[PDB]
């Protein structure tokens, strides 16, 4: 009945999350700069589909997650998958201001973000979030904590709550290790967590966008359709 997650130390939690990390996947090696609606969403759908398989196996390595019933695991993944994809996208796009690094061989700018009604708004939001993470000097150890929080929190409505508290402890532990003052710790903690509200917003808007693409642009995988249908 008792979860191993809570018995982990802060450094153990960090290492577990770092080790659970999915790899950065590549897009198609077709040299063409995507501008068409079909071409760009074709590349993004294919990429996200492959990322999802890694995400699912990543989630099972998040401490506390496998302690949940299978149906709860399903629920949390259906709720948070686009949030998790997006914060990953935003993270690896940090060192590329004004651009989004969907893949090492697929960097898109706002100009490609046009051409389709409903993208450039969400595109601009992703860029602002990336720029925000960059200015805060978000660390990889902080990033994996936030991503895990998103997984456990987004569809949470006792065990999850204590695991969430544990991750909070881990974040503070990281900032304290980084030499931050106590004031800087709770301030930075607040700043990070408020960005999760924007990530939630971007996911919801993005999900609307995907349903529109669904109702016949590019063929979706059965997995993507089911993850999509989960949001009604």
């Amino acid at each position: 009945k008792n979860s191993l997650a809570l018995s982990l130390t802060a450094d153990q939690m960090v290492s577990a999350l770092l080790d659970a990390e999915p790899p950065i996947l590549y897009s198609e090696y077709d040299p063409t700069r995507p501008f068409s609606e079909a071409s760009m969403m074709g590349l993004l759908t294919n990429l996200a589909d492959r990322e999802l398989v890694h995400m699912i196996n990543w989630a099972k390595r998040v401490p506390g997650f496998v302690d949940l019933t299978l149906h709860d695991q399903v629920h949390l993944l259906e709720c948070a998958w686009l949030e998790i994809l997006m914060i990953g996208l935003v993270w690896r796009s940090m060192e590329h201001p004004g651009k989004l690094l969907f893949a090492p061989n697929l960097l898109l700018d706002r100009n490609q973000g046009k051409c389709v009604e409903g993208m450039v708004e969400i595109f601009d939001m992703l860029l602002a979030t990336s720029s925000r993470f960059r200015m805060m000097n978000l660390q990889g150890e902080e990033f994996v904590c936030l991503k895990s929080i998103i997984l456990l929190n987004s569809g949470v409505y006792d065990h999850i709550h204590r695991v969430l508290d544990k991750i909070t402890d881990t974040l503070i532990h990281l900032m304290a290790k980084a030499g931050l003052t106590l004031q800087q710790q709770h301030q930075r903690l607040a700043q990070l967590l408020l960005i999760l509200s924007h990530i939630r917003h971007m996911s919801n808007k993005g999900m609307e966008h995907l349903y529109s693409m669904k109702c016949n642009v590019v063929p979706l995988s059965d997995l993507l359709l089911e993850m999509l249908d989960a949001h009604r």
Binding site: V53, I56, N57, A59, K60, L70, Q73, V74, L77, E78, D222, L223, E226, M227
Partner: peptide, 10 residues
């Protein structure tokens, strides 16, 4: 029966 159910198993 969702694909997610199968994948979360193995």
């Amino acid at each position: 029966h969702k694909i997610l159910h199968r994948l979360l198993q193995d």
